[PDB]
Amino acid sequence: MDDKALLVEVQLLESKTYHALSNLPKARAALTSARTTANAIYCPPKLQATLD
Amino acid sequence: PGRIDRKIEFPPPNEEARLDILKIHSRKMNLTRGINLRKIAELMPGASGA
Amino acid sequence: PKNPDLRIAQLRFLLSLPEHRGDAAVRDELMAAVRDNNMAPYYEALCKSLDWQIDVDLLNKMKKANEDELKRLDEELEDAEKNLGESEIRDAMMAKAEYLCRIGDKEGALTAFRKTYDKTVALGHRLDIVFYLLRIGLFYMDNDLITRNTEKAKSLIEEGGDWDRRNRLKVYQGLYCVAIRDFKQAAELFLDTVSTFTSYELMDYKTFVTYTVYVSMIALERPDLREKVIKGAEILEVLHSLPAVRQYLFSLYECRYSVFFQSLAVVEQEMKKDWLFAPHYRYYVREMRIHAYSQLLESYRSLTLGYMAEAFGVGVEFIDQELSRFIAAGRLHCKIDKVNEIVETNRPDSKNWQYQETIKKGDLLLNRVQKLSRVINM
Amino acid sequence: MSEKKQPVDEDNWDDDNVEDDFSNQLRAELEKHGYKMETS
């Protein structure tokens, strides 16, 4: 779809649960795909520290 | 033209030619499945081939 | 047709050979047998199960209908449509044999596969037929067909296409676990566990994880077992689903031996429900019981078997008799004792180990050039 | 090359070393080997 801002959070929420299943290389992979998506939004005003 | 008689250009390749060179160098590579090499060469308007 | 088919061959085993187990397999096989049009193999299976029931002639005319309905298709096809090779005659007549693999016995299916194998020219259609032979040789565990076509899959086919071989990597070591090769060849190429969806070519995933974790702790003790299965993370996801399997792992690695036997007790009894099962159970447990003893006698050289009476289980005389059987077996390199009640060990040194290997290999090559010198000189 | 000394002449596929070791020691290995603990 067209939206971008909601995608940064749900990529980030999966990086919690792949780490919650103790899958460390996949959670590194899903986090980096959340990084390259995060750089094109008006505000990640609180989602920045969540990502950090 | 007494010395050099054939003067041969080398333009940048076409979409079919970019498709073919991609087939050559991905030969030893290990492709997954479900993969379209044609759209990749469509993404290069004026590549070199190197 | 063949794709969810292997669960049937589980219930063929589970109903038959444990004679007490005749309660629940027939409850979800017969309703599956009146489904799926399964008609040719179950006659002997109905003999070992409850004797007869008249649904036989019901699906006999129904298996004759779909036989004739597609037989009249591809005979009219070959008499009207004139392409060959991988033509419409091809995929109709492989649909006849895949009607045979789902319904009929193996014999009509395999001769139709050999009928259609030499009519092909593309290796991808050849390998998919060899997929079918390997699966029907795995249905009826026939060890003659599976040894042949794997060599056909290696040599004659898979110098071409790619990553339809990992589907048969799981089949090469499906052969090795139904064989007694529970040692290294199974656990080596089970180790690439990146094949997820429970397909025909990946018959199950979660039980595949249990298969590759049972066989894994025999291939290697500590030449970095812990990196490939314990520091491995994609394996660690799905053994976080199964608590008993993970407890069986970490008891052995973190040296909890008393709960290790209770875990190993569940494993051997749970192993009983398996159809590649005959090489496992009498050999698997005794190899692991002597595996736990060998590392436990390591780090000590004056052990007392009274310390085995509570740190380990119970049964002073039980440890005594089982070590005595294993020392006399030529394994388990230590020396049990009576009234001092001190399990002393003896392990060789470097030189006492190297001297033994050179005198074994020395007499081998000496005998080898004995016989060779007698072949020459008349 | 006869010697004229002829005149007379996994199921069990690799089992006989393991079979010569143990054969019939209540091979279920649970009902006593794991069930010591009610005796102790």
UniProtKB/Swiss-Prot annotation, chain A:
Subunit: Component of the 19S proteasome regulatory particle complex. The 26S proteasome consists of a 20S core particle (CP) and two 19S regulatory subunits (RP). The regulatory particle is made of a lid composed of 9 subunits including PSMD11, a base containing 6 ATPases and few additional components.
Organism field: Homo sapiens
Cellular compartment(s): Nucleus; Cytoplasm, Cytosol
Gene designation: PSMD11
PTM field: Phosphorylated by AMPK.
Family stated for the protein in its record: Belongs to the proteasome subunit S9 family.
Purpose: Component of the 26S proteasome, a multiprotein complex involved in the ATP-dependent degradation of ubiquitinated proteins. This complex plays a key role in the maintenance of protein homeostasis by removing misfolded or damaged proteins, which could impair cellular functions, and by removing proteins whose functions are no longer required. Therefore, the proteasome participates in numerous cellular processes, including cell cycle progression, apoptosis, or DNA damage repair. In the complex, PSMD11 is required for proteasome assembly.
Protein name: 26S proteasome non-ATPase regulatory subunit 11
Induction or repression: By FOXO4; expression in embryonic stem cells (ESCs) is mediated by FOXO4.
Curated annotation (Swiss-Prot), chain B:
Domain of life according to the entry: Eukaryota
Annotated localization: Cytoplasm; Nucleus
Quaternary structure note: Component of the 19S proteasome regulatory particle complex. The 26S proteasome consists of a 20S core particle (CP) and two 19S regulatory subunits (RP). The regulatory particle is made of a lid composed of 9 subunits, a base containing 6 ATPases including PSMC5 and few additional components. Component of a complex with USP49 and RUVBL1. Interacts with PRPF19. Interacts with TRIM5. Interacts with NDC80. Interacts with PAAF1. Interacts, in vitro, with the thyroid hormone receptor (in a thyroid hormone T3-dependent manner) and with retinoid X receptor (RXR). Interacts with ERCC6.
Job of this protein: Component of the 26S proteasome, a multiprotein complex involved in the ATP-dependent degradation of ubiquitinated proteins. This complex plays a key role in the maintenance of protein homeostasis by removing misfolded or damaged proteins, which could impair cellular functions, and by removing proteins whose functions are no longer required. Therefore, the proteasome participates in numerous cellular processes, including cell cycle progression, apoptosis, or DNA damage repair.
Family: Belongs to the AAA ATPase family.
Protein's UniProt name: 26S proteasome regulatory subunit 8
Organism from which the protein derives: Homo sapiens
Positions spanned in the full protein: 308 to 357 of 406
UniProtKB/Swiss-Prot annotation, chain C:
GO cellular component, one term: secretory granule lumen
Residues covered by the PCI domain: 182-350
SMART domains (UniProt xref): PINT
Gene3D superfamilies to which the protein is assigned, alphabetical: 1.25.40.570
TM segment ranges: none
UniProt KW Membrane keyword: no
Summary of subunit composition and partner proteins: Component of the 19S proteasome regulatory particle complex. The 26S proteasome consists of a 20S core particle (CP) and two 19S regulatory subunits (RP). The regulatory particle is made of a lid composed of 9 subunits including PSMD6, a base containing 6 ATPases and few additional components.
Protein task: Component of the 26S proteasome, a multiprotein complex involved in the ATP-dependent degradation of ubiquitinated proteins. This complex plays a key role in the maintenance of protein homeostasis by removing misfolded or damaged proteins, which could impair cellular functions, and by removing proteins whose functions are no longer required. Therefore, the proteasome participates in numerous cellular processes, including cell cycle progression, apoptosis, or DNA damage repair.
Family per record: Belongs to the proteasome subunit S10 family.
Protein name (record): 26S proteasome non-ATPase regulatory subunit 6
Organism: Homo sapiens (Human)
UniProtKB/Swiss-Prot annotation, chain D:
Assembly with partners or alone: Component of the 19S proteasome regulatory particle complex. The 26S proteasome consists of a 20S core particle (CP) and two 19S regulatory subunits (RP). The regulatory particle is made of a lid composed of 9 subunits including SEM1, a base containing 6 ATPases and few additional components. Belongs to the TREX-2 complex (transcription and export complex 2), composed of at least ENY2, GANP, PCID2, SEM1, and either centrin CETN2 or CETN3. Component of the homologous recombination repair (HR) complex composed of ERCC5/XPG, BRCA2, PALB2, DSS1 and RAD51. Interacts with the C-terminal of BRCA2.
Tissue spec. comment: Expressed in limb bud, craniofacial primordia and skin.
One Gene Ontology CC term in the entry: cytosol
Location(s), subcellular: Nucleus
GO biological process: double-strand break repair via homologous recombination; mRNA export from nucleus; proteasome assembly; proteasome-mediated ubiquitin-dependent protein catabolic process
Pfam families cross-referenced by the UniProt entry: DSS1_SEM1
Protein name: 26S proteasome complex subunit SEM1
Family per record: Belongs to the DSS1/SEM1 family.
Gene giving rise to this polypeptide: SEM1
Keywords: Nucleus, Proteasome
Keyword Hydrolase attached: no
SMART domains (UniProt xref): DSS1_SEM1
Organism: Homo sapiens
Top-level lineage group: Eukaryota
